[PDB]
Amino acid sequence: DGASIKFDSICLYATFFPMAHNTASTLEAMLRNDTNDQSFNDYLSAANML
Amino acid sequence: MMQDATDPAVRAALQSQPSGLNSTDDWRQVMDRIMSLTARNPDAFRQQPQANRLSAILEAVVPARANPTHEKVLAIVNALAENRAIRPDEAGLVYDALLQRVARYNSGNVQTNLDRLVGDVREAVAQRERAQQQGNLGSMVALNAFLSTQPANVPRGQEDYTNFVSALRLMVTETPQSEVYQSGPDYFFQTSRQGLQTVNLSQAFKNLQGLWGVRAPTGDRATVSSLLTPNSRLLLLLIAPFTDSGSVSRDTYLGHLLTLYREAIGQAHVDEHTFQEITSVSRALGQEDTGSLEATLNYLLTN
């Protein structure tokens, strides 16, 4: 019909917790090992077909 | 009963390796659990769901190699935190800097040493933790410098000082914890408490070298012994709960005042047992009894 969108500089607004610098260097130990890994999935973990 | 410093090779294992069931490491513990041989309940493996049942069989019958490096390298770096070879905030760098070091050298004879060094560094925590309780190590070596520099066994006036040589050595052996013979300035000085509220110079003691044997008046503070500095007076009250008999109590104040320093301690522990009772009986008095301290003043002044 007649429409156009133009983009400028895209950004990222990363926010985390201001962790205690003694703890921020020592609490990593859980994720520092390959034993326990932050695992995620969709509730509809499904695969379709068209 | 109490523990030693939480085992440094185990603290780092606590944070890395599996807790409940490591099917390869605790193989005959899982094998005992799956064979219905466990004494708690035999059929704890039978009543479980069939899929995780199979997960226990596949993992235990065929033992799978689990990663051991990160509970060995961290065992060093967390021991480096307990032995204080690194600061607690340094746990991000040295953990991986040595992992990047073993990334370059995974496979020399060095890592065969590393695990032998693991047993050495974990023992070094246990060795030093028992050694810091006896702070004699940073005290006796310091006293060796004191005994060498200060002229030993030269009382050519009168000699009672031979007994005093061992008296300073007894202070190192009996109380070791915070008792550090620090050599900051060139004068030697000893601290008694963790916060150092009586740390006098052992070179203020050099005032006593001419007063090792002088004449005694009568029983009231002497006509001469006013020269003894509150600095050296602080030392002689601090050696008083260590040595009593030996120095002549009738020839100079090295002994007469040392017996009188026991009079200060002798009143103190009696008044300690006096104060712990009158303060405890505050339900029946109902007042700020400063008379507990006023009687303490009266039991020292009116004698």
Domain limits, chain B: 1-134, 138-303
The alpha carbon of residue A2 is apart from the nearest alpha carbon of chain B, in Å, by: 55
Alpha carbon B226 to chain centroid, angstroms: 38
* Start-end of H helices in B90-184: 94-104, 110-132, 140-149, 161-174
Q: CB of B76 within 8 A of CB of B117?
A: yes
Residues 61-100 of B with CB under 8 A from A: 67, 70-71, 74, 88-92, 95
* Residue among B106, B105, B109 at smallest CA distance from B117: B109
**Chain A residues in contact with chain B using a Cβ-Cβ cutoff of 8 Å:** 21-22, 24-26, 28-30, 32-35
Nearest-10 Cα torsion for B258, B260, B263, B265? -40
Structure tokens at B159: 């000699």
Residues in chain A: 50
- The closest CB to that of A25, out of B12, B67, B92, belongs to B92
Instruction: For tokens 């073993």, name the residue.
Output: B102
Beta bridge partners of B189: B201
Report resolution in angstroms.
3.8
Q: CB of B23 within 8 A of CB of B30?
A: yes
Residues in chain B: 303
CA B303 – CA B231 distance, rounded (Å): 26
CA angle B93, B98, B103 (to 5 degrees): 120
* Start-end of H helices in chain B: 8-14, 27-34, 50-61, 73-82, 94-104, 110-132, 140-149, 161-174, 230-238, 253-278, 291-301
Closest alpha carbon within chain B to A29: B15
N-terminal to C-terminal alpha carbon distance within chain B? 46
Structure tokens at B92: 């991000």
Structure tokens at A9: 């500089």
Alpha carbon B120 to chain centroid, angstroms: 22
Q: CB of B193 within 8 A of CB of B178?
A: yes
The alpha carbon of residue A38 is apart from the nearest alpha carbon of chain B, in Å, by: 15
- The closest CB to that of B88, out of A22, A29, A35, belongs to A22
CA B112 – CA B117 distance, rounded (Å): 9
Cβ contact, residue pair B15, A34, below 8 Å: no
Report the number of secondary-structure helices (H) and strands (E) in chain B: 11, 0
Three-state SS annotation for B166-204: HHHHHHHHHCCCCCCCCCCCCCCECCCCCCCCCCCECCC
Relative orientation angle of helices B253-278 and B291-301, to the nearest 10 degrees: 160
DSSP structure class, residue B237: H
Method: X-ray
Fold (topology level) of B1-134: Four Helix Bundle (Hemerythrin (Met), subunit A) (1.20.120)
